[PDB]
Design a protein around this ligand. Sequence first.
Ligand SMILES: [Cl-]
Ligand SMILES: [Cl-]
Ligand SMILES: [Zn+2]
Ligand SMILES: [Zn+2]
Lengths: 400, 400
Amino acid sequence: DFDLIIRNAYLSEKDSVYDIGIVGDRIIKIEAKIEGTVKDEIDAKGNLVSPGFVDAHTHMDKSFTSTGERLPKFWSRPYTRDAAIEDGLKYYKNATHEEIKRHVIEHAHMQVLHGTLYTRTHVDVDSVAKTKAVEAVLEAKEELKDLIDIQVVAFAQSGFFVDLESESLIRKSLDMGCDLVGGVDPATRENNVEGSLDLCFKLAKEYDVDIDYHIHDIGTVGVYSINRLAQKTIENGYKGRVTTSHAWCFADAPSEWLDEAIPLYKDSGMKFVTCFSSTPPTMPVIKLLEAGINLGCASDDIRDFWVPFGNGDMVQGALIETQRLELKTNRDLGLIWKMITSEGARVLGIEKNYGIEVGKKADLVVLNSLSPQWAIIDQAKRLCVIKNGRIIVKDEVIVA
Amino acid sequence: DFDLIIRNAYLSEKDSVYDIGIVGDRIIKIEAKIEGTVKDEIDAKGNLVSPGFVDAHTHMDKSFTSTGERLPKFWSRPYTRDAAIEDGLKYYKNATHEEIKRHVIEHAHMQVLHGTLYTRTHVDVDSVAKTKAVEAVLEAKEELKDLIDIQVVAFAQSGFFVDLESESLIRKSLDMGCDLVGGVDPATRENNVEGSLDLCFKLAKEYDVDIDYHIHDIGTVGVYSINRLAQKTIENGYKGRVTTSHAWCFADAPSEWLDEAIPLYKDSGMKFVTCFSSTPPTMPVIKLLEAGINLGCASDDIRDFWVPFGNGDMVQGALIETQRLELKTNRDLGLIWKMITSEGARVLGIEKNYGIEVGKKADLVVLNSLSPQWAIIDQAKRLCVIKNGRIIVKDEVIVA
Ligand SMILES: [Cl-]
Ligand SMILES: [Cl-]
Ligand SMILES: [Zn+2]
Ligand SMILES: [Zn+2]
């Protein structure tokens, strides 16, 4: 019979309560009542059971570097991208393989305590970090495979045309086994939009990897950089293989620029990720989703020299998004929930095995709340977390 | 001898770790090490101990009315003030004294679990509620005297010049013992700014009570309404006795209007409350505080037909404000912390007995975090809550 049954699980997509039967790492049966009994059971008690949350953009390598003292380190100054880059170069100067590795494990545990079972982390690759951070992350990734699936982005944080050693280092990193490649700000960092982008596509083709680009530039220069990225996506036959992270520019650029760009994004299969530690309040999130653009959600940095905040909790991030974007209706909170779940899945390219349906992966979160909406509102802690059909978290403890 | 000693308490205002000695409801000794006998002790273990949080604007009477189903009630339609007023009139048509009372105690317990020991609630007074809600709240207030101090605003939710029965009903309500009086939107609700305000000042003088006004109107009409309120504050000799809640208008009105109004606000001793369930993202919070304007913070409604959110947790609210306003520096998170503490106290008029100083009330919160900043960031649960020198909360349960 079953390896695991979840009793009395409210499923949002079906709007009813079901027993869930699991064998190995797969969901086999979803029924109003499953008969009769097996060794491992979890009673969800009428509360929501959800697939694992998806944190589509993190920086596990540099997380928790702000911790250590009474006040967060690094935060006696305001945030600016270039200064945050410089703090990274100091930090990476003499950080050891093991300090990074432990940060990554710490990060993952926190995430998984909150029911995130899938994440895509960017890792700094530049002339100071070299491939040291890539090494530590790949190593930790391997150790964490029973807790959390990780996609790794070889991330040229300093700029391909600013730090001229980046190209060969990204090349090593991808050969070490990073799963995607990405740059930062073609325009205001690189000062070369065509060049930075072409180089990124070249590297992606050499190693047959997907792309995740950090585009922070605000306004029309940001929309323009994404437009170029999207057009080159088509030219290079990379439809559906490119993610644009942040895209804060959609918030202040004229709405017309977005209206005109949307068919291009749909035609290029452009994917986006908005991080709840920075989503602009006038970000047209709802509009993007209603237009059928694939928009995921994410923590971004956690407790470092870019972002002091962070608990790796996508349910807390959903609440933050509702506040940033002033959402209140059940429909809208419902859309945000999709963003931390199935939209993130699609961004990650795992949609086929993702969801609470027969045949899907037994990667689940049993919550202490009645519905997506109530979970966002009441912020109750996770009751149970299940990965590969095995219970890995039970009542605030990693039991794996 | 002490009735209570808190060991190893990090105090933000002193930036060091101290023992806190308490007798009855008072702090009597603060010292690096307190030798002496003692009945009860709490070890804060190097973590931050803070005074009780101040939730300067709530609506305890209608709270939790959204609860009951799988999805929040009322949230199949978006929010507009007038529609919310209409849901209240339906709700209040059939609500019983006991229902309201229970909502108020639930609300208070929740607040207190999170270390709020002081709150100002508004209570709907209009031709449907009549004084029923005032009755339930005053009764509950009495029962809750050992957990939380409550100020009650007789609040003319429907408008003095719209619901004509409001004036006599507010009179009764103040005679029943409400501590302040308040209206809503002189301009777009009442359609009479001079009249609505003069009437309010009239009722305040008859019963010698302070004023708390809901001003939601956006833009210049909002600034104008507050300017008239502030000028009439001076004319009526009510300096320091008037609070403006919300003032969303400061966010979209031209910055010049605020610049010119600031001396008037200082001159009138105008107090403000921003609620974290609605603070506009471009609200000039930092600017107000730097100018020495007294700005408190608050939950506003909790789980009702105005706001579906709510946990009565001012530490969670502080995180939300950092996100709404995009704050990250230690200095700014510090200012937000003042807003949920000492600024709220000053809005309430209790600043003299408020704080962790010798002679002050023994109303305290022992946290599981190192500092104001880390508390906002890590959102750790409260370790211990102390009111009137007695432990009322210990490990997520009310032990009073
Ligand atoms: Cl170019
Ligand atoms: Cl008028
Ligand atoms: Zn990033
Ligand atoms: Zn209000």
